Amino acid sequence: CPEGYILDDGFCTDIDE
Incomplete structure (x- = not known):
């Protein structure tokens, strides 16, 4: 998985927080 x-x-x- 990507950054x-x-x-x-x-x-x-997606967990970009």
Whole structure:
């Protein structure tokens, strides 16, 4: 996953906060 994104539900979710 790219910067600002992480794997949660087997998918790169946006968590840029």
